[PDB]
Structures are given as structure tokens and as C-alpha cells.
């Protein structure tokens, strides 16, 4: 009597029998990001190695990822 | 956290819900022998775009195909058939019908994109068949390639979504028979290039209660495999290849009974890090694993 | 006066500092002091120490919230590869400093 799906840039889709929550069912979609913003702010070519590393380190720090930031700096 | 609500206007139970590749469309099938397609607007509400009769018996499952081939959907029914539909320019038309079956068809799934356009169906008589479309721009011509006998009933199948060149194609099959004797209910098949035939690779002798759903996990760079099983409880397994059929070291890393009832459906997320489970109580539960490989719950949704 | 054949330097022991209340300053000051003697190794090591001992990498209390920086391959494993290198050279003066800053 059930159906589930997890499609993402977002949340779930649940369909369950109405005697569990008979010959009817109830369908509801729930409402439960850092990937898109870091993919168009990076830089992979066109500068020497030192200039590339510090640029990427600035993006990660602003987004809120500190561990990733220090990996760029050590490199 | 929040919960929307949409009126399906179906005349019987909804048996399946599926999202698409880009996350904006949605399909729903029921026992009133119909298939509906939903779209999302900028306002955020969902509207029904199409609705048409498909089979003469109950429809169990509906699934999408990769957008490289078109807008394609597949369905299976109690009519012992399976169909392929395509959207053309704004209604849907039937392209083929697969009628080789002899009992009810219980599941249908599309193969990962790097194998081509492939389909796999399972039947209540214990036969799993695999079809193929050699030329993409003619969707009315399929071709039967393989056939597997499982010596038991069948209820669910799943592919291995790994895209590596070191992993051969896989498929896993689950049973639902409730005979008093205790036999294995999950079997895994593998494809050998030299002989060009699927062969049995491993069996899960630890699973004896009936199975209701089975799902692999997205790989995204891992070196081993993860499997999720729906039974009286929730079990999660690991298969690590070793250095004929390939040998695996099978372990179990979760067994959760927080539903206190039968578990019906399972589903993973895009990155393969969170698992969602649905049970007879009417609640959805989410599981996640920390860096010490201990799986713990993360939310309850009702 | 054969002091150019030992792994310890007397000037560095007079220029090195330890200050528990501000780790960042000590690493930079020692990196500067390593250049006055001309040791390429120590400058790079003290540079890495600064970024590896920042205050933005503090461990948390709940295991199921993040992966600690120690498990990261730039944490315990890099320290245990510098310590094993300097052990073979018998350089007590760097081992004692490193084992103290990271405490």
C-alpha cells in the first residue's frame, strides 16, 4: 500500500493507504546547495599555481567549509 | 520538515511514485488502471498535465528513462504485459508491448545509461528477462537477449548504478514466498564477458523472512557495493570484491527494528549517503552513517 | 669547536620561543628565525604548522556531527611522517618543539 521516492534538489514523495494514517490513498510531498555555488566560483586554468590555490581557498572559507580551505593552502 | 499535500484524484490505491532525471516531473500509477504525470510551476504547486488509460489490470510500477533517449516511461501490470510510452509534439503514445510473460509482471527497471537502452522485468513464476533496443531512434523494436530462472517467486529487482570499468554489470533479485521451509530470498547475478551469459555470484543465506523491496546505492567513487533490503526489519550489506564469477566478502552493518511492523519500501538519495524507509505504522525514517561506520537515525516524518 | 657536525644548533635555542596563549605568533616567529640560519627544511615545516594548528579546526563534542581534523590525511599521518623523518637524523631540537606545539 505504499510508495516512496527521493528526488533531489529537494525532498521525498510519500503515498500511503488512508486506513494506515479502505480503497483510497493519500499522497504528500515533503520539504526536507553548497554544490552549485562552489562549482561556478572556482578556477581551474589561466593563472599560475599559487594564484589558483589562494582563490579557491577564499571561496571555501566564505561558504563555511574550513577543512577544505586549509587543504588548498597546504597544497 | 514541512509537508505539502496534493489531490491525486485516483479512484483506488496508488502503487508507485517516481521522479525524473532533472527533478521537475513526477509519475503516479494506481489500481484503477491509469498513469498520471505531474509538473512543477514557478509558484511551487504541482499540476496534472496528462492522464490516460494504460492496461486492463492493476498497474504496479512505473519508471523513467534517461533524457538522452527522449521522454520515456515504462509500466507493468496484472495483465501479464509491459509497455513503453513516449511524449511527442502534447500527448503520450505507445511504442511497444512486451507479452512474453505467462504470469503477472511485478517489476520493471531501466539499465544505467552506459549500457545503452536496456530493460529488465521480473514475473511471479520466477523468470527475469532482459531486453534491448539496438537502434535508439526506433523505439518500437526491442530484442530479447537473456533469461534467468530463480526457482522461486520474484517481487523486486535492482541494477548496480556503478559506472566504473572494473565493475561488471549486476542485478539482484528478491523473493516473497512464505513457505514454512527456510531458503534464501536474495540472489545476485553477474555478467561474464568471455561466455556472454549471466551467472549466479552470491546468495544471502542469512535472509529468510519474505522480502518486499531491494535497492542498491549510488557509487560516486566508492570501491565497494552497498545493498538495502526491506523485510520484517531493515538490513544493510557490504560486498567488497577480491583480487568465472567474482568472489565477495559479505558483511552486515545494520539491522533496525524501530518500525515494529513490516517494512514496505526503501529509497536512497542522490549521493548515496542517506536512506529512507517506510513501514506499516505510516511513518518515514532516515538513516545516516558517521565516520566510525555506525548507522544512526536522523529524522522521523509522519 | 666541532659544532657543524651535530643536528642541534645553539643559535636556534637562543632564538626559539614558546607561548601557550598565542600559538600562531610562535610559529611565524620561529619560521622567521629559521631563515637567519639558512635551513630550508624548517621554514617549510613551521609554515605547515601554522595552518595545521589554526583555531578554526577545533574538535567538537558529538561524534555524529563532523569528521575530526585528526583523521584527515593532513593531520595525524603527516605529523607521524615528519616525526619519523627527524628521528633518523637524531634532531631532538625539532622533535621536542613539534611535540610541544601540537599538545
UniProtKB/Swiss-Prot annotation, chain A:
Changing residue 74 to E: Abolished interaction with WDR59 and assembly of the GATOR2 complex. Signal peptide: none annotated. Autoubiquitinated; MIOS is required to prevent autoubiquitination. It is found in: Lysosome membrane. Catalytic component of the GATOR2 complex, a multiprotein complex that acts as an activator of the amino acid-sensing branch of the mTORC1 signaling pathway. The GATOR2 complex indirectly activates mTORC1 through the inhibition of the GATOR1 subcomplex. GATOR2 probably acts as an E3 ubiquitin-protein ligase toward GATOR1. In the presence of abundant amino acids, the GATOR2 complex mediates ubiquitination of the NPRL2 core component of the GATOR1 complex, leading to GATOR1 inactivation. In the absence of amino acids, GATOR2 is inhibited, activating the GATOR1 complex. Component of the GATOR2 subcomplex, composed of MIOS, SEC13, SEH1L, WDR24 and WDR59. The GATOR2 complex interacts with CASTOR1 and CASTOR2; the interaction is negatively regulated by arginine. The GATOR2 complex interacts with SESN1, SESN2 and SESN3; the interaction is negatively regulated by amino acids. SESN1, SESN2 and SESN3 convey leucine availability via direct interaction with SEH1L and WDR24. Belongs to the WD repeat WDR24 family. This is GATOR2 complex protein WDR24. The lineage of its organism: Eukaryota, Metazoa, Chordata, Craniata, Vertebrata. The chain holds residues 340 to 452 of 790 of the full protein.
From Swiss-Prot, chain B:
There is a cross-link at residue 11 (Glycyl lysine isopeptide (Lys-Gly) (interchain with G-Cter in SUMO2)). It is found in: Chromosome, Centromere, Kinetochore; Nucleus, Nuclear pore complex; Lysosome membrane. The GATOR2 complex is negatively regulated by the upstream amino acid sensors CASTOR1 and SESN2, which sequester the GATOR2 complex in absence of amino acids. In the presence of abundant amino acids, GATOR2 is released from CASTOR1 and SESN2 and activated. SMART domains: WD40. WD repeats lie at residues 9-48, 54-89, 100-141, 149-199, 206-243, 258-297. Keywords: Cell cycle, Cell division, Centromere, Chromosome, Chromosome partition, Isopeptide bond, Kinetochore, Lysosome, Membrane, Mitosis, mRNA transport, Nuclear pore complex, Nucleus, Phosphoprotein, Protein transport, Repeat, Translocation, Transport, Ubl conjugation, WD repeat. GO terms for cellular component: cytosol; GATOR2 complex; kinetochore; lysosomal membrane; nuclear envelope; nuclear pore; nuclear pore outer ring; Seh1-associated complex. GO terms for molecular function: structural molecule activity. The modification Phosphoserine is found at residues 168, 179. The keyword Protease does not apply. GO terms for biological process: attachment of mitotic spindle microtubules to kinetochore; cell division; cellular response to amino acid starvation; cellular response to nutrient levels; defense response to Gram-positive bacterium; mitotic metaphase chromosome alignment; mRNA transport; negative regulation of TORC1 signaling. Belongs to the WD repeat SEC13 family. Component of the Nup107-160 subcomplex of the nuclear pore complex (NPC). The Nup107-160 subcomplex is required for the assembly of a functional NPC. The Nup107-160 subcomplex is also required for normal kinetochore microtubule attachment, mitotic progression and chromosome segregation. This subunit plays a role in recruitment of the Nup107-160 subcomplex to the kinetochore. This is Nucleoporin SEH1. It comes from Homo sapiens (Human). The gene is SEH1L.
UniProtKB/Swiss-Prot annotation, chain C:
Belongs to the WD repeat WDR59 family. This is GATOR2 complex protein WDR59. Component of the GATOR2 subcomplex, composed of MIOS, SEC13, SEH1L, WDR24 and WDR59. The GATOR2 complex interacts with CASTOR1 and CASTOR2; the interaction is negatively regulated by arginine. The GATOR2 complex interacts with SESN1, SESN2 and SESN3; the interaction is negatively regulated by amino acids. Interacts with DDB1-CUL4A/B E3 ligase complexes. It comes from the Eukaryota. As a component of the GATOR2 complex, functions as an activator of the amino acid-sensing branch of the mTORC1 signaling pathway. The GATOR2 complex indirectly activates mTORC1 through the inhibition of the GATOR1 subcomplex. GATOR2 probably acts as an E3 ubiquitin-protein ligase toward GATOR1. In the presence of abundant amino acids, the GATOR2 complex mediates ubiquitination of the NPRL2 core component of the GATOR1 complex, leading to GATOR1 inactivation. In the absence of amino acids, GATOR2 is inhibited, activating the GATOR1 complex. WD repeats lie at residues 18-56. It is found in: Lysosome membrane. The chain holds residues 651 to 753 of 974 of the full protein.
Amino acid at each position: 500500500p505504499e510508495g516512496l521516492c527521493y528526488g533531489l534538489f529537494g525532498d521525498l514523495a510519500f503515498a500511503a493507504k488512508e486506513s494506515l494514517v479502505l480503497a483510497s490513498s493519500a499522497l504528500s510531498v515533503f520539504e526536507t546547495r553548497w554544490f552549485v555555488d562552489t562549482a561556478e566560483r572556482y578556477a581551474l586554468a589561466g593563472r599560475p599555481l599559487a594564484e589558483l590555490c589562494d582563490h579557491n581557498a577564499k571561496v571555501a572559507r566564505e561558504l563555511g567549509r574550513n577543512q577544505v580551505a586549509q587543504t588548498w593552502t597546504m597544497l | 520538515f514541512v509537508a505539502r499535500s496534493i489531490a491525486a484524484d485516483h479512484k483506488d490505491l496508488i502503487h508507485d511514485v517516481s521522479f525524473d532525471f532533472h527533478g521537475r516531473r513526477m509519475a503516479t500509477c494506481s489500481s484503477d488502471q491509469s498513469v498520471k504525470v505531474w509538473d512543477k510551476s514557478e509558484s511551487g504547486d504541482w499540476h496534472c498535465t496528462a492522464s490516460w488509460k494504460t492496461h486492463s489490470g492493476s498497474v504496479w510500477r512505473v519508471t523513467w528513462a534517461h533524457p538522452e533517449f527522449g521522454q520515456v516511461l515504462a509500466s507493468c501490470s496484472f495483465d501479464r504485459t509491459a509497455a513503453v510510452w513516449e511524449e511527442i509534439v502534447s500527448h503520450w503514445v505507445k511504442r511497444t508491448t512486451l507479452v512474453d510473460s505467462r504470469t503477472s509482471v511485478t517489476d520493471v527497471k531501466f539499465a544505467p545509461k552506459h549500457m545503452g537502452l536496456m530493460l529488465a522485468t521480473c514475473s511471479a513464476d520466477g523468470i527475469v528477462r532482459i531486453y534491448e533496443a539496438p537502434d535508439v531512434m526506433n523505439l518500437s523494436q526491442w530484442s530479447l537477449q537473456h533469461e534467468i530462472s530463480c526457482k522461486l517467486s520474484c517481487s523486486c529487482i535492482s541494477w548496480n548504478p556503478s559506472s566504473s570499468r572494473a565493475h561488471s554489470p549486476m542485478i539482484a533479485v528478491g523473493s516473497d514466498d512464505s513457505s514454512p521451509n527456510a531458503m534464501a530470498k536474495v540472489q545476485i547475478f553477474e555478467y561474464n564477458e568471455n561466455t556472454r551469459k549471466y551467472a549466479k555470484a552470491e546468495t544471502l543465506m542469512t535472509v529468510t523472512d519474505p522480502v518486499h523491496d531491494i535497492a542498491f546505492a549510488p557509487n560516486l567513487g566508492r570501491s565497494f557495493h552497498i545493498l538495502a533490503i526491506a523485510t520484517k526489519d531493515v538490513r544493510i550489506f557490504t560486498l567488497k570484491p577480491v583480487r568465472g564469477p567474482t568472489k565477495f566478502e559479505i558483511h552486515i552493518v545494520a539491522q533496525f527494528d524501530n518500525h515494529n511492523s513490516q517494512v514496505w519500501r526503501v529509497s536512497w538519495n542522490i549521493t548515496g549517503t542517506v536512506l529512507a524507509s517506510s513501514g506499516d505504522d505510516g511513518c518515514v525514517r532516515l538513516w545516516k552513517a558517521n565516520y566510525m561506520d555506525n548507522w544512526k537515525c536522523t529524522g522521523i516524518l509522519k | 669547536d666541532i659544532a657543524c657536525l651535530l643536528p642541534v644548533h645553539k643559535s636556534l635555542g637562543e632564538l626559539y620561543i614558546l607561548n601557550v596563549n598565542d600559538i600562531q605568533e610562535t610559529c611565524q616567529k620561529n619560521a622567521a628565525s629559521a631563515l637567519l640560519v639558512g635551513r630550508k627544511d624548517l621554514v617549510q615545516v613551521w609554515s605547515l604548522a601554522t595552518v595545521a594548528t589554526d583555531l578554526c579546526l577545533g574538535p567538537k563534542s558529538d561524534p555524529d556531527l563532523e569528521t575530526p581534523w585528526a583523521r584527515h590525511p593532513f593531520g595525524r599521518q603527516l605529523l607521524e611522517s615528519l616525526l619519523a623523518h627527524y628521528c633518523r637524523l637524531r634532531d631532538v631540537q625539532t622533535l621536542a618543539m613539534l611535540c610541544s606545539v601540537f599538545e
